[PDB]
From a paper:
The paralog of TRIM24, TRIM28, and TRIM33—termed TRIM66—also contains a PHD-Bromodomain at its C terminus. Our results show that the PHD domain of TRIM66 recognizes both unmodified H3R2 and H3K4 residues, whereas the Bromodomain interacts with the H3K56ac peptide through its ZA and BC loops. Further studies show that TRIM66 regulates the deacetylation of H3K56ac by recruiting histone deacetylase Sirt6, providing the appropriate chromatin environment for subsequent DNA repair and safeguarding the genomic integrity of ESCs.
The residues T6 and K9 of the peptide contacted the residues D971, L977, N978, and G980 of the PHD finger. The side chain of R2 was hydrogen-bonded with D986, C985, E968, and N969, as well as a bridging water molecule. Moreover, we observed hydrogen bond interaction between the side chain of H3K4 and the side chain of D971. In short, the PHD-Bromodomain of TRIM66 specifically recognizes both unmodified H3R2 and H3K4, whereas TRIM24 and TRIM33 only recognize unmodified H3K4. Compared with other proteins of the C-VI TRIM family, we found that the side chain of the glutamic acid in TRIM24 and TRIM33—D986 in TRIM66—was excessively long to form hydrogen bonds with H3R2.
Residue numbers in the entry:
A (entry chain C): 1 to 10
B (entry chain A): 965 to 1017, 1039 to 1155
The structure:
């Protein structure tokens, strides 16, 4: 599967 | 970067570590998908919305009810109903004596739960309780009441599509 890593909101 | 997929979890709209659907652009936190995942799967993965179709629900009804509930969760109008109302909110729990939210509905889709759904009828009843509580507590002209009414219209559409052979009372 493909995984995406973005920044969480804060 | 996987730009063919969205950048925010379809359910909670936050970023982070996201699993990509291989048939639609949606992405999901492992725990936000319905049913939740405990690890990233190997090989191809298709989300519950893109999938084709004895305690607990039958496996037929389990897949349909998962599609119904995830459809609600991914609609952004559902965001006010994902979590229980803040126990600090004014008068809510004096007015609403049987609260219901989508995190509770998701938990009861699991046959390990002591209150697990055994029929689609019980699922639909809890969704309609959510809409009923929204209409009772919030003034009809408010933004939350309007989101509730619109999301209910979406939900009745999905019921006819996923369960055409069934009509759910009231
Ligand atoms: Zn999420
Ligand atoms: Zn998908």
């Amino acid at each position: 599967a493909r995984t995406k890593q973005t920044a969480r909101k804060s | 970067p996987h730009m063919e997929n969205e950048d925010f979890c379809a359910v909670c709209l936050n970023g982070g570590e996201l699993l990509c659907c291989d048939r639609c652009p949606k992405v999901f936190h492992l725990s936000c998908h319905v049913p939740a995942l405990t690890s990233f799967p190997g090989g191809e993965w298709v989300c519950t919305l893109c999938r084709s179709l004895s305690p607990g629900l039958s496996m037929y009804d389990q897949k349909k009810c998962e599609k119904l509930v995830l459809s609600l969760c991914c609609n952004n109008l559902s965001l006010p109903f994902h979590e229980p109302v803040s126990p600090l909110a004014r008068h809510y729990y004096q007015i609403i004596k049987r609260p219901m939210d989508l995190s509770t509905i998701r938990r009861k889709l699991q046959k390990k739960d002591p209150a697990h759904y055994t029929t689609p009828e019980e699922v639909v009843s809890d969704v309609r309780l959510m809409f009923w509580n929204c209409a009772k507590f919030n003034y009809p002209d408010s933004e939350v009441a309007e989101a509730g009414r619109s999301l209910e219209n979406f939900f009745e559409g999905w019921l006819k599509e996923i369960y055409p052979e069934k009509r759910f009372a009231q």
